[PDB]
Amino acid sequence: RNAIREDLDNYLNEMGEVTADNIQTWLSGRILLIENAAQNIAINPEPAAVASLLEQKALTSTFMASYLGDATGHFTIRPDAKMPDGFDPRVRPWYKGAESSSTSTLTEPYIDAATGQTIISIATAAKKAGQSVGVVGGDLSLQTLINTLSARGMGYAFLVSADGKILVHPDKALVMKSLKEAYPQDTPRISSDFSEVTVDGKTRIVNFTPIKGLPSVNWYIGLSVDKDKAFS
Ligand SMILES: CC(C)C[C@H](N)C(=O)O
């Protein structure tokens, strides 16, 4: 094994890059739809126009919901949903995220005010010549992200922030845990090209690949493979 080790490294690196590239491409189109909705909203922000934009099938078929929230606390959501009493878009993570960035952004997983399930959102400020008229967002379910990741018997991919927080993992118990909390006995390190760590009495090899071309966030694909199966 100390002969083909540099070999295995090359396969694992290649698989990480491919997986990162797929997820980037999958997210990019969705990012573009939300940006386009924001650009269009900024053309005419009257609520009738906004509603009509947000009701179109390209958006409603791609996102669980798409919406605009503004600095007065008003919001429009399509498809319409009953929101909790007192719902204020200004305090929600999609809104504060977009307001803190010069470009589009993606949230970490959070609890959806609409459905009560764990989601991420894509969001961007809708600007008319330098002035923001509000924040436009769209929601994607965790289950959707988990399925996108498990699509492509050595091992599996997961998504982790560059702060070391697991964002999306096929084991749902590890969602939104730090690497340390998720792997307490022997912790993989994003600062290492490869981490050999024992899980349930087996050696796994873990590497991390940056996902290029996302706006505002720096996230990695983690790959974890059984060390015997990989060598075999
Ligand atoms: C705007 C709404 C559809 C809900 C949004 N995802 C939230 O939790 O704030």
Q: How far is the CA of 191 from the centre of ligand 1 (A)?
A: 35
| 97 within ligand 1 shell (Cβ under 6 A) | no
DSSP-H helix ranges across the chain: 5-41, 47-54, 57-60, 93-99, 142-150, 179-182, 227-231
Please report, as a single letter, which amino acid is at residue 80: D
CB 21 within 8 A of CB 213: no
Please name the residues in contact with 230: beta carbons below 8 A apart, sequence gap of 6 or more: 8, 11, 12, 154, 155, 205
C-alpha distances out from residue 149 to 21, 112, 155, Å: 12, 21, 12
Please name the residues in contact with 163: beta carbons below 8 A apart, sequence gap of 6 or more: none
Would you call 63 exposed, middle or buried from its count of C-beta atoms within 10 A (0-12, 13-18, 19+)? buried
Q: Which residues pair with 178 in a beta bridge?
A: 165
* C-alpha span between 30 and 98 (Å, rounded): 16
Q: How far is the CA of 114 from the centre of ligand 1 (A)?
A: 6
Please report, as a single letter, which amino acid is at residue 57: K
- Tokens representing 103 are 């470009």
- 201 phi-psi bin (left φ>0, alpha ψ -120 to 50, beta other): left
* C-alpha span between 126 and 98 (Å, rounded): 10
Give the resolution value in Å: 2.0
> What technique was this entry resolved by?
X-ray
- Tokens representing 49 are 């126009």
DSSP 164: S
Query: Up-side HSE of residue 196: CA atoms within 13 Å toward CB?
Result: 8
| 53 within ligand 1 shell (Cβ under 6 A) | no
DSSP for 6-65, please give it. Answer: HHHHHHHHHHHHHHHHHHHHHHHHHHHHHHHHHHHHTT---HHHHHHHHTSHHHHTTSS-
Cis before 79? omega within 30 = yes
Q: Which residues pair with 226 in a beta bridge?
A: 204
| 68 within ligand 1 shell (Cβ under 6 A) | no
C-alpha distances out from residue 84 to 63, 140, 211, Å: 20, 19, 35
Q: How far is the CA of 150 from the centre of ligand 1 (A)?
A: 26
Element counts in the chain: helices (H) and strands (E): 7, 11
Measured from the Cα of 69, ligand 1's closest atom is 1
* C-alpha span between 180 and 165 (Å, rounded): 9
Backbone angles phi and psi of 110, in degrees to 5:
-150, 175
Please name the residues in contact with 121: beta carbons below 8 A apart, sequence gap of 6 or more: 93, 94, 97, 106, 107, 110, 137, 138, 139, 140
Q: Of the candidates 125, 136, 128, which has an alpha carbon nearest to the alpha carbon of residue 54?
A: 136
Q: Which residues pair with 106 in a beta bridge?
A: 122
C-alpha 104, offset from chain centre: 13
**Taking the CA atoms of the chain, what radius of gyration do you get in angstroms?**
20
